[PDB]
Design a protein around this nucleic acid. Structure first.
Ligand code: 1SY
Ligand code: 1SY
Ligand code: ZN
Ligand code: ZN
Lengths: 359, 359
DNA sequence: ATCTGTACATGTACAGAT
DNA sequence: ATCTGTACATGTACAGAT
DNA sequence: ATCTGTACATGTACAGAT
DNA sequence: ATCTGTACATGTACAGAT
């Protein structure tokens, strides 16, 4: 039943090969451009993130996410009023003459300006490439990405995401986040929090305050580690261990949402990150690998579904790394929208998911 | 029962404080002296190893192992007669002002010369210490250590072990070693094998060829890791996890052997590394954390005893990292000594462990 | 001036103490 | 059940080197 | 400092086994 | 139907070389 759907969603070796050689050509070229050109982004480094590199991409290999991360030195952060996830970045002491002088304002590092130069460089280099059909997608407000459209023959999107890499303690808003103690352990949590944290040029809204200079926290690196080290036993899904169905529940849920979203404009507010967050919480609630036995795929998916509905009903979905940050606040997502998704999901669930059969 | 014995073997904090303050001073001063002038050992680095840092030291904190390890860049290893564990080290390059030219014995690096110099410097530094009563112990045949004897009132041994560090991949003799795949897993094993490997002086005084140019492999770093990360579950012995009794079993077995060795000179051939190796094999054999439940301390200890007895009776105890290196070979330990230990352990096992009550 | 090796600063798992 | 000393990892300050 | 080489994890594919 | 085992492919870490 769901086995058949997973067979459908499973990427094909040839397709992965073909898509990857092309994306890697383009990304390589861009990345070389960033340092080989005496730019203000010299020293930038590649970190692949997201579904494809987490092995939870479904249907086709047509979306690739990449961070270009730049080690900015000692910076001071300021919480963009009690969101937890948004900040203004100032320099403790401006060492001066540095690459990012012209991105500053009043001791503040403007996300908009820096992103716009990043973008300008990217468009410029993209015009300079002749063996691949590749263009730059129109900018979306509220997006930290510069997105590329490649037509191999087939359509592939690539998000190039500029990120500041900071090596200090994680911000205090994350102190109670990443609650993996009973699941992946305290040693894993402590190690993960010894890793750098990332800031991303996503603008905060209202259109009120310092919208354009605002950055946002990102833990794409931590999420990648988790997705690939997801068991309570060290050998989960390893060649000398036993398979679980955690990844496949993520795939099915992502598929449900993708399908519902294709059909219904009313679901625009919702996204795959909501599903990823919800399953992270579920993996926390039920840490034992035995609670994700492949033979229990259906019930596992069902429990995931019920949890998601609960989140819609209570209108609460806390960011996994930032507890105070409610992804389903009435501010972010309209109540009517959550009732709508609730009803659609309940429909599909109660009728053996007809929408898994269509295209 | 055995729990009361473990209560007796538990180290006291006040003792730990006292011993560690002194040990750390002396080690600190030696490492610093090595790091000075134009000594051959400049660049040497410190790695604390063995029981005390594995948290399996018993009775008193009166023994400390510390590795002074030196990276040796270009390096070629020749195996010593298919023994798996023993090698000659050759620099197939030119000195270029090499600090180790002085120890070169025509293409090869001499263990005994290097050790001799290391030791001479240590002795010299120890003379300049007037705070505490610390002396250098008479050299022991077959020992890669310069041993210090500190009278901190209480007598304390500090083994300063000279080591060569190579960052290349491990020698082929270890390919089928470290069989942790069904226990700690493939990712863990790959990571450990990405770590450097060590070489320490064999320093036998037997009389055989290449006696003073023979080094032995060492993985005390890896062993430390395994001891501190010993569960199939990432949360084993953590604060949101379940305690197991693996280390407690190691403690009991170490204690049985120590008591017997102090009573009977017949057991000089045996050492604690034998029980460490046996228990690593047991942990591979019985990988589930539920096979080391604290409630089953007697059973677990007993199965360990049973296993160990067979090793004596079949004359086989494979080095965990080097399969073909048999620690109980006829050539290392006499059948009489093995029979003697077998009978001692059998007796102990079948009559309440009276030796646990001694002293 | 600027640079950087050394060692202090901070955090927490582990396991003894109370 | 909580409190707490050691070992250990990583971030960062500044003296003395350049 | 930038790059290639090596090893092995993560995947898919598909013929022969259960 | 599912499992197993071999072949096939990419992603990622990091030693070591110029
Ligand atoms: N990845 C991610 N992290 C979030 O915290 C987040 N919050 C909302 N969303 C939305 O989920 C959807 C799917 O994300 P995808 O990864 O496929 O592409 C994302 C991703 O490649 C990148 N991106 C967005 N936020 C971040 C982030 N915090 N860190 C790194 N990359 C990010 O920009 C793309 C678009 O972001 P948005 O147009 O703002 O909204 C996304 C998107 O609609 C998020 N997506
Ligand atoms: N650690 C260790 N690794 C071995 O492969 C080995 N083979 C035999 N032995 C013997 O176990 C006994 C207890 O070891 P301990 O750790 O307390 O002190 C050891 C330890 O501090 C150190 N040492 C010995 N072998 C090594 C080694 N291979 N690597 C690092 N250090 C070592 O020098 C001390 C004396 O060594 P030996 O007199 O050669 O024989 C030892 C010892 O009699 C070994 N011990
Ligand atoms: Zn798994
Ligand atoms: Zn344990």
């Amino acid at each position: 039943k769901l086995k058949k759907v997973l067979d459908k969603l499973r990427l094909k070796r040839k397709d992965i090969s073909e898509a990857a050689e092309t994306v890697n050509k383009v990304v390589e070229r861009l990345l070389r451009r960033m340092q080989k050109r005496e730019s203000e982004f010299k020293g930038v480094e590649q970190l692949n993130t997201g579904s494809y590199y987490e092995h939870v991409k479904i249907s086709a290999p047509n979306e690739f996410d990449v961070m270009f991360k730049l080690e900015v030195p000692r910076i001071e952060l300021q919480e963009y009023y009690e969101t937890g996830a948004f900040y203004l970045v100032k320099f403790k002491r401006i060492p001066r003459g540095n690459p990012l002088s012209h991105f500053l304002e009043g001791e503040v590092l403007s996300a908009t300006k820096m992103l716009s130069k990043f973008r300008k460089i990217i468009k410029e280099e993209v015009k300079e490439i002749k063996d691949i059909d590749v263009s730059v997608e129109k900018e979306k407000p509220g997006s930290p990405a510069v997105t590329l459209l490649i037509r191999n023959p087939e359509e592939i999107s690539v998000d190039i995401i500029l990120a500041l890499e900071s090596k200090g303690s994680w911000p205090i808003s994350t102190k109670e986040g990443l609650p993996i103690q009973g699941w992946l352990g305290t040693k894993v949590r402590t190690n993960l929090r010894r890793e750098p944290f990332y800031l991303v040029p996503k603008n905060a809204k209202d259109g009120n305050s310092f919208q354009g200079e605002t950055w946002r926290l990102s833990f794409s690196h931590t999420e990648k580690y988790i997705l690939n080290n997801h068991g309570i036993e060290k050998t989960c899904c390893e060649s000398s261990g036993a398979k679980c169905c955690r990844k496949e529940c993520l795939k099915l849920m992502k598929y449900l949402l993708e399908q519902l979203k294709k059909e219904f404009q009313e679901l625009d507010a919702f996204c795959s990150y909501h599903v990823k967050t919800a399953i992270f919480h579920m993996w926390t609630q039920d840490p034992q690998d035995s609670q994700w036995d492949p033979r229990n795929l259906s019930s596992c998916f069902d429990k995931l579904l019920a949890f998601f509905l609960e989140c819609l009903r209570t209108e609460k979905l806390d960011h996994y790394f930032i507890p105070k940050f409610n992804l389903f606040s009435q501010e972010l997502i309209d109540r009517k929208s959550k009732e709508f998704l609730s009803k659609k999901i309940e429909y599909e669930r109660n009728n053996g998911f007809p929408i898994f059969d269509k295209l």
